Amino acid sequence: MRGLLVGRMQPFHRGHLQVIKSILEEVDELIICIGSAQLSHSIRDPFTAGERVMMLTKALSENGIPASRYYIIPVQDIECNALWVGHIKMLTPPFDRVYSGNPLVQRLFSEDGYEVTAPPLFYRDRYSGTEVRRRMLDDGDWRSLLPESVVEVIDEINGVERIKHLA
Numbered sequence: 001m002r003g004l005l006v007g008r009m010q011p012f013h014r015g016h017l018q019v020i021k022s023i024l025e026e027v028d029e030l031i032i033c034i035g036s037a038q039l040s041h042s043i044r045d046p047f048t049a050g051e052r053v054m055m056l057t058k059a060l061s062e063n064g065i066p067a068s069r070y071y072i073i074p075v076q077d078i079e080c081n082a083l084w085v086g087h088i089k090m091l092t093p094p095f096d097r098v099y100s101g102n103p104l105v106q107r108l109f110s111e112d113g114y115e116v117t118a119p120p121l122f123y124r125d126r127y128s129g130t131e132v133r134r135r136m137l138d139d140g141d142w143r144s145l146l147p148e149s150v151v152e153v154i155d156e157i158n159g160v161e162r163i164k165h166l167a
């Protein structure tokens with residue numbers, strides 16, 4: 001029983017972490033696709049896919065979730081939304097259920113015949129990439145929004161300096 005979760009993870013935050021843990025209570029393995037893998041260095045998508053692979057790896061590891069329970073697969077975006085479900089399928093192991101709070105993702109997988117679950121949002125007003133990046137830019141408390149392993153990654157790659165320069 002394998003689930004699928006798609007997210008840009010810009011950057012991976014505590015909301016992503018909560019949702020993943022609960023998904024792991026109902027599936028054996030979780031495929032985690034890092035969407036928009038071709039985008040980096042913009043205010044909306046600051047981090048490369050590879051930096052995001054590291055954030056994920058360190059966070060899940062820090063929280064003791066064994067690697068054999070999930071897959072991390074970067075997925076570039078494509079021009080045709082009508083082909084995107086097939087694009088994900090092509091790049092991943094087979095899966096039984098899809099988890100997403102994104103309307104487009106929900107609708108595409110639904111039209112393709114998949115049951116889609118929209119888990120309850122964990123602290124939706126603070127746990128969002130938008131809020132994290134807004135705090136990094138305006139000097140607010142972004143660190144408390146992310147697992148500490150992710151903050152370490154962001155420090156090592158000079159993420160704040162990057163985003164501020166870009167803005």
Ligand SMILES: NC(=O)c1ccc[n+]([C@@H]2O[C@H](COP(=O)([O-])OP(=O)(O)OC[C@H]3O[C@@H](n4cnc5c(N)ncnc54)[C@H](O)[C@@H]3O)[C@@H](O)[C@H]2O)c1
Pocket residue numbers: 006007008009010014015016018019034035036037076077078079080081084099100101102104105119120121122123124127128129
């Ligand atoms: N044609 C295409 O190329 C196409 C079509 C559809 C989607 N996509 C890609 O899908 C990706 C989009 O993922 P996104 O925008 O939803 O990323 P995101 O990182 O903002 O959200 C990831 C998912 O994590 C969960 N989540 C996030 N915050 C949460 C919180 N506080 N509490 C609980 N759960 C929470 C939700 O399931 C959410 O949909 C993008 O890369 C997008 O480009 C591509």
Ligand code: NA
Pocket residue numbers: 007008009010011128129130
């Ligand atoms: Na994000």
